[PDB]
Amino acid sequence: APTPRTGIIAGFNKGHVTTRRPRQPSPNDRFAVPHKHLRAVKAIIADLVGLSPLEKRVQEFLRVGKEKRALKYCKKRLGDFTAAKKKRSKMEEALRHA
Amino acid sequence: RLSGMNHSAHSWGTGRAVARIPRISGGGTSTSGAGAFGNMCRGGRMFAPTKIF
Amino acid sequence: PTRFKKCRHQRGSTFCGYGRVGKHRKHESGRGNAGGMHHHRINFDKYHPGYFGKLGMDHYHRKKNPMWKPTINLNNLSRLIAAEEAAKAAKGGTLPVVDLQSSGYAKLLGNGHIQVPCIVKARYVSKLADKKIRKAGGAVVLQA
Amino acid sequence: PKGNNAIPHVHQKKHWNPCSSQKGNVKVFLNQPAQKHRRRRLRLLKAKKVFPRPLKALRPQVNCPTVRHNMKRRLGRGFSPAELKAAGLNPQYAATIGIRVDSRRKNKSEEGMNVNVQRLKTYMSKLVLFPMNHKKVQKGEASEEEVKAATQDRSRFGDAAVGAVVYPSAEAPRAVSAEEKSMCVYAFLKKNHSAVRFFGTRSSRAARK
Amino acid sequence: GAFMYLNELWKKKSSDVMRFIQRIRSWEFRHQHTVVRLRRPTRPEKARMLGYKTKQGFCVFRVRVRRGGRKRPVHKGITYGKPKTSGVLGMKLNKNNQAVAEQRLGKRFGNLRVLNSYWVNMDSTFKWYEVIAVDPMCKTIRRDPRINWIVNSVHKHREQRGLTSAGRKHRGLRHKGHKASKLRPSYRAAWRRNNRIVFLRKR
Amino acid sequence: GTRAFRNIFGLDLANVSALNLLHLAPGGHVGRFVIWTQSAFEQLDKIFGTFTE
Amino acid sequence: PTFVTMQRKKRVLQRRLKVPPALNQFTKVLDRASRNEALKLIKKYAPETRKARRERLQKVAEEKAPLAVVTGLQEVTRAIEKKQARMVVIANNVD
RNA sequence: AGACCUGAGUGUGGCAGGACUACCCGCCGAACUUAAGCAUAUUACUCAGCGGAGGAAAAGAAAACAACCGUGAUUCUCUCAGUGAGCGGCGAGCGAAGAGGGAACGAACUCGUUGCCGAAUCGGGUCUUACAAGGCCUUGAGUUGUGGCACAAAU
RNA sequence: CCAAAGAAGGUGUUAGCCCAUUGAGCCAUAAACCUGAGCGCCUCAUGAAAAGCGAGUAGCACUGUUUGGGAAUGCAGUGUCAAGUUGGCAGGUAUUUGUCUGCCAAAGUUAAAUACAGAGUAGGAAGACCGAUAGCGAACAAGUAGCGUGAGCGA
Ligand SMILES: [K+]
Ligand SMILES: [K+]
Ligand SMILES: [K+]
Ligand SMILES: [K+]
Ligand SMILES: [Mg+2]
Ligand SMILES: [Mg+2]
Ligand SMILES: [Mg+2]
Ligand SMILES: [Mg+2]
Ligand SMILES: [Mg+2]
Ligand SMILES: [Mg+2]
Ligand SMILES: [Mg+2]
Ligand SMILES: [Mg+2]
Ligand SMILES: [Mg+2]
Ligand SMILES: [Mg+2]
Ligand SMILES: [Mg+2]
Ligand SMILES: [Mg+2]
Ligand SMILES: [Mg+2]
Ligand SMILES: [Mg+2]
Ligand SMILES: [Mg+2]
Ligand SMILES: [Mg+2]
Ligand SMILES: [Mg+2]
Ligand SMILES: [Mg+2]
Ligand SMILES: [Mg+2]
Ligand SMILES: [Mg+2]
Ligand SMILES: [Mg+2]
Ligand SMILES: [Mg+2]
Ligand SMILES: [Mg+2]
Ligand SMILES: [Mg+2]
Ligand SMILES: [Mg+2]
Ligand SMILES: [Mg+2]
Ligand SMILES: [Mg+2]
Ligand SMILES: [Mg+2]
Ligand SMILES: [Mg+2]
Ligand SMILES: [Mg+2]
Ligand SMILES: [Mg+2]
Ligand SMILES: [Mg+2]
Structure with a gap:
């Protein structure tokens, strides 16, 4: 399954030629598998507790229509751009479910 | 490493009409102000004390 | 040995070769490499040019293993070919096979005239080395 | 008078020297022969204690990493569960048998696994397993004669059963083929190197067209 | 299990209900002592994660510390020597x-x-x-393989030597490899490795 | 086979498989009187080799 | 004493601040008559004691438990998640 | 009446306290000195100070290396390497990490969690020669969860 | 005349044979340690024959410190603070996208290699070291006599 090597020290598939084995299944492969029960527990808890002040601010930003400002606010509060994208997506989904 | 130096010896300075070698502090004994720490002093440390390295 | 030093010869000389005038004082010029730009400038300038300043890009996490690339010339290939292997070797016949990476070399260089023709297995090769080794009746085989 | 010397960088400005005011920071090796003798004595006492078991447990063969050492071979930490399975052994039982087990090392190629499985086959063929109760021998255990035969492996690397690490054999002297005469090796290697060296800029110039 | 719900609730520390609960609890703890013995932990899930069991010999204490940066205890804010070491606040x-x-x-x-x-x-x-403590003389502790180790004399005052999780945190033992090369096994150990002058016998 | 020679004062034992220069040349002066057994003597070609082997 | 004043003031401060619905729902409780009936029904189906279980396991030694209410946070939560619970009773003063 | 929760007072059974502190672990922490001056730097993450343990301590079982044909907990040794790394009034000076040869190594386990059970748990009495990893008895703790089974060396 | 003993201490001068010593071996033995995980009895144990995994945490910001770690190596205070449905961390030049490799933090226990740089207990082996102003301050009723209010100093 893995691409065989060319036997050359240079090139696209450089390296000594061995009969490569495929990646074996690992117990860590479940970390990238959907967690439905964790999602259900988190939804129940989120419904129980309400919204964060950060979540309220982002939802007002999204209702007003300043998505870029919501993303900037999330980036400053969370510190990373990926987390800001995820939080803004969560708040948009919350608004759609309303 | 402590063989000539286990004293609180200090020089008396000039103006006392004695050599500026450090001397044993305190009184009441025969070593009081007796000169110390030097390879030329009676109970002092040898020159370039030998090492195990 | 202590009996061969100048100290033994200078017993009774009262100065041990440091003079009556200048004398032997603790640090008359500073300590170590002090003053390389002040009062030691001439020494540094004429004996160690290029000592001060910056030059080139930085390589933060330098690893010597990826950079490993020792070289051997064509006229030194007999060091890897055995005696009876070298004796029985000519163009068009059975040639000794030299494995460079097993012998500790990565690239084959083309300096000099190859003495005994052979088949060389090398990771790298210069163009002149490849051309010469083919002209001599040997060959270069790439390897990783 | 300083003259033409190397610029000194002797690196001895800390209180390394033991003196009247400093404990120092040194490490002498005056105990080296005594420690070597102690180590050999301890290895002999351990061998006598664990008799007849070999003093060193069985280790696999691995390939040294990086392009500087990938042509070299040495003993690894322990046999992978894949190699142990291919040799017909349960890893937990193999640990009790005297085989080191490493669950971290993955087999990225067939050759390494085959080498280590051959090591395991040879070891299990040479293995003499003593019975738990010599009045009731089970399947796979030794007999009275084999137990009496005993004998212990005291090799430095625990390699009497399986030998030293095996390197690939040298290629026999050969004749250059017509292709090897014709082909320009430098051009081939250089173009393969350039394919990766300029890959990004070639792909960027592939766009805008 | 119930643990998932407790853990998810405790991940929502800034929610309105959790802020209300923490407000009430903080007022209560403000009007209490610096060290308070507790019959049961305030967060059973966290305590059991960290090693607390509902067994004889396990104790929970709540400890209060004051916040803010350290003020150097020099008289009248007067330091000496190089200005590098002149900071007070x-x-x-x-x-x-x-x-x-x-x-x-x-x-x-x-x-x-x-x-x-x-x-x-x-x-x-x-x-x-909330600090988990164990009685080494309790029979339940001494006869339980899980917590049996802490009876051993090498674990006396392990918080004073930085062996607890928080001590490991501020020692840099959370990292391995190139992030902690000069920190392992300790700063002192690595400094001794890198600074002791080695005299080989024949050299 | 050294049992009878250990206590002889003035007779030093040696093993041909480990010859010591400190005993072959005491004080740095070559020319020590050495007594060879035939079996040890015959191993000198193997141990030290020849000019060609 | 300090603890008496603290418990009284804690009740006062819980009454005085704005209590979110998640916590305020526990203030509103079931009616007293219905509470008595539920407690009676649970009392009838109380779990076996140590002595009762010991006697039952001694009786079975010459060869499960009778129907009872599920008790304990873990087991009750598992019953709820798997929807085996017909009715769940929750205390209003858990701390 | 009583119960629970939160706190007391006594009885019973225990532990802590100081010493040592050469090495080891945590914090705190200088200056002399060098830079031919000196403030960053250096001395030095050292001395002094405070606290803690052992026969060793600490570390240790990959949110590790690497970029290989790949390696495989920790610790230590030689080398890497006084380094064509790097940090530095880029000055004085500092300055490591992979890999490789080795020492050692039966080296691996335990909780929490998640599923399935649900007191099967733990202390006390008392009897087995027995403060049994045993049997009986005990609301006494414990369901605001003790314990058992499975989780990649597994099936 | 001994020597499987020549071993270096003592005895009135320089001792293999004056003495002690210098071996094989014998006697005794609380437990602990080692031996078909030594070998019996009672008792007690015991082998095989779908979900999700550590949250004021990790990150960011500012400030301090530390590091060779350099648009920030580790840590600390405060702020505010996650993800897990396509997850997270690391991959030594900051950012936004992709693609690849390893690995799965925020709970815990673990021997051996290593230190003993002014420790201690019971024993040993010594030395191209010093030889009474030397060597430990101390070869002696030495941390003694003596001095100082005292910390201490100290023959
Ligand atoms: K100041
Ligand atoms: K400074
Ligand atoms: K003898
Ligand atoms: K912080
Ligand atoms: Mg002296
Ligand atoms: Mg004269
Ligand atoms: Mg001169
Ligand atoms: Mg001069
Ligand atoms: Mg520049
Ligand atoms: Mg002193
Ligand atoms: Mg048996
Ligand atoms: Mg290291
Ligand atoms: Mg103490
Ligand atoms: Mg100094
Ligand atoms: Mg200066
Ligand atoms: Mg000066
Ligand atoms: Mg000045
Ligand atoms: Mg420093
Ligand atoms: Mg100190
Ligand atoms: Mg101690
Ligand atoms: Mg330890
Ligand atoms: Mg490793
Ligand atoms: Mg080098
Ligand atoms: Mg070099
Ligand atoms: Mg430094
Ligand atoms: Mg190695
Ligand atoms: Mg549990
Ligand atoms: Mg004599
Ligand atoms: Mg047995
Ligand atoms: Mg985790
Ligand atoms: Mg945080
Ligand atoms: Mg610094
Ligand atoms: Mg530990
Ligand atoms: Mg000692
Ligand atoms: Mg004297
Ligand atoms: Mg004296």
């Missing part, structure tokens, strides 16, 4: 408040073994940690 303690609370609890009650600690509440003036 801006310096920070190189040990976290969790380790400080663990060490306070340990030095107060020397008959107990500190196991772990967790954050329970925070305030503008104080932070509270």
Whole structure:
């Protein structure tokens, strides 16, 4: 399954030629598998507790229509751009479910 | 490493009409102000004390 | 040995070769490499040019293993070919096979005239080395 | 008078020297022969204690990493569960048998696994397993004669059963083929190197067209 | 299980209900002592994660520490020597408040073994940690393989030597490899490795 | 086979498989009186080799 | 004493601040008559004691438990998640 | 009446306290000195100070290396390497990490969690020669969860 | 005349044979340690024959410190603070996208290699070291006599 090597020290598939084995299944492969029960527990808890002040601010930003400002606010509060994208997506989904 | 130096010896300075070698502090004994720490002093440390390295 | 030093010869000389005038004082010029730009400038300038300043890009996490690339010339290939292997070797016949990476070399260089023709297995090769080794009746085989 | 010397960088400005005011920071090796003798004595006492078991447990063969050492071979930490399975052994039982087990090392190629499985086959063929109760021998255990035969492996690397690490054999002297005469090796290697060296800029110039 | 719901609720620390609960608890803890013995932990899930069991010989104490940076204890804010070392207010303690609370609890009650600690509440003036402690003389502790180790004499006052989780945190033992090469096994050990002058016998 | 020679004062024992220069040349002066057994004597070609082997 | 004042003031401060619905729902409780009936029904189906279980396991030694209410946070939560619970009773003063 | 929760007072059974502190662990922490001056830097993450343990301590079982044909907990040794790394009034000076040869190594386990059970748990009495990893008895703790089974060396 | 003993101490001068010593071996033995995980009895144990995994945490910001770690190596205070449905961390030049490799933090226990740089207990082996102003301050009723209010100093 893995691409065989060319036997050359240079090139696209450089390296000594061995009969490569495929990646074996690992117990860590479940970390990238959907967690439905964790999602259900988190939804129940989120419904129980309400919204964060950060979540309220982002939802007002999204209702007003300043998505870029919501993303900037999330980036400053969370510190990373990926987390800001995820939080803004969560708040948009919350608004759609309303 | 402590063989000539286990004293609180200090020089008396000039103006006392004695050599500026450090001397044993305190009184009441025969070593009081007796000169110390030097390879030329009676109970002092040898020159370039030998090492195990 | 202590009996061969100048100290033994200078017993009774009262100065041990440091003079009556200048004398032997603790640090008359500073300590170590002090003053390389002040009062030691001439020494540094004429004996160690290029000592001060910056030059080139930085390589933060330098690893010597990826950079490993020792070289051997064509006229030194007999060091890897055995005696009876070298004796029985000519163009068009059975040639000794030299494995460079097993012998500790990565690239084959083309300096000099190859003495005994052979088949060389090398990771790298210069163009002149490849051309010469083919002209001599040997060959270069790439390897990783 | 300083003259033409190397610029000194002797690196001895800390209180390394033991003196009247400093404990120092040194490490002498005056105990080296005594420690070597102690180590050999301890290895002999351990061998006598664990008799007849070999003093060193069985280790696999691995390939040294990086392009500087990938042509070299040495003993690894322990046999992978894949190699142990291919040799017909349960890893937990193999640990009790005297085989080191490493669950971290993955087999990225067939050759390494085959080498280590051959090591395991040879070891299990040479293995003499003593019975738990010599009045009731089970399947796979030794007999009275084999137990009496005993004998212990005291090799430095625990390699009497399986030998030293095996390197690939040298290629026999050969004749250059017509292709090897014709082909320009430098051009081939250089173009393969350039394919990766300029890959990004070639792909960027592939766009805008 | 119920643990998932408790853990998810405790991940929502800024929600309105959790802020209300923490407000009430913080007021209560403000009007209590610096060290308080608790019958049961405030967060059973966190305590059991950190090693607390509902067994005889397991104790929970809540410890209060004051917040803010460390002020250097020099008279009238007067330092000497190089201006590099002239700071009085801006310096920070190189040990976290969790380790400080663990060490306070340990030095107060020397008959107990500190196991772990967790954050329970925070305030503008104080932070509270609940410290898990174990009685080494309790038969239940001494005959239980899980916690049997802490009876051994090498674990006396392990919070004072930085062996707890917070101590490991402020020692840099959370990292391995190239992030902690000069930190392992300790700074002192690596400094001895890198600074002792080696004299080989033949050289 | 050294049992009878250990206690003889003035007779030093040696093993041909480990010859010591400190005993072959005491004080740095070559020319020590050496007594060879035939079996040890015959191993000198193997141990030290020849000019060609 | 300090603890008496603290418990009284804690009740006062819980009454005085704005209590979110998640916590305020526990203030509103079931009616007293219905509470008595539920407690009676649970009392009838109380779990076996140590002595009762010991006697039953001694009786079975010459060769499960009778129907009872599920108790304990873990087991009750598992019953709820798997929807085996017909009715769940929750205390209003858990701390 | 009583119960629970939160706190007391006594009885009973225990532990802590000080010493040592050469090495080891945590914090705190200088200056002389060098830079031919000196403030960053250096001395030095050292001395002094405070606290803690052992026969060793600490570390240790990959949120590790690497970029290989791949390696495989920790610790230590030689080398890497006084380094064509790097940090530095880029000055004085500092300055490591992979890999490789080795020492050692039966080296691996335990909780929490998640599923399935649900007191099967733990202390006390008392009897087995027995403060049994045993049997009986005990609301005494414990269901605001003790314990058992499975989780990649597994099936 | 001994020597499987020549071993270096003592005895009135320089001792293999004056003495002690210098071996094989014998006697005794609380437990602990080692031996078909030594070998019996009672008792007690015991082998095989779908979900999700550590949250004021990790990150960011500012400030301090530390590091060779350099648009920030680790840590600390405060702020505010996650993800897990396509997850997270690391991959030594900051950012936004992709693609690849390893690995799965925020709970815990673990021997051996290593230190003993002014420790201690019971024993040993010594030395191209010093030889009474030397060597430990101390070969002696030495941390003694003596001095100082005292910390201490100290023959
Ligand atoms: K100041
Ligand atoms: K400075
Ligand atoms: K002898
Ligand atoms: K911080
Ligand atoms: Mg002296
Ligand atoms: Mg004269
Ligand atoms: Mg001269
Ligand atoms: Mg001069
Ligand atoms: Mg430049
Ligand atoms: Mg002193
Ligand atoms: Mg058996
Ligand atoms: Mg290292
Ligand atoms: Mg103490
Ligand atoms: Mg100095
Ligand atoms: Mg200066
Ligand atoms: Mg000067
Ligand atoms: Mg000055
Ligand atoms: Mg420093
Ligand atoms: Mg100190
Ligand atoms: Mg001690
Ligand atoms: Mg330890
Ligand atoms: Mg490793
Ligand atoms: Mg080098
Ligand atoms: Mg070099
Ligand atoms: Mg430094
Ligand atoms: Mg190695
Ligand atoms: Mg449990
Ligand atoms: Mg004599
Ligand atoms: Mg047995
Ligand atoms: Mg995790
Ligand atoms: Mg945080
Ligand atoms: Mg610094
Ligand atoms: Mg540990
Ligand atoms: Mg000692
Ligand atoms: Mg004297
Ligand atoms: Mg004296």
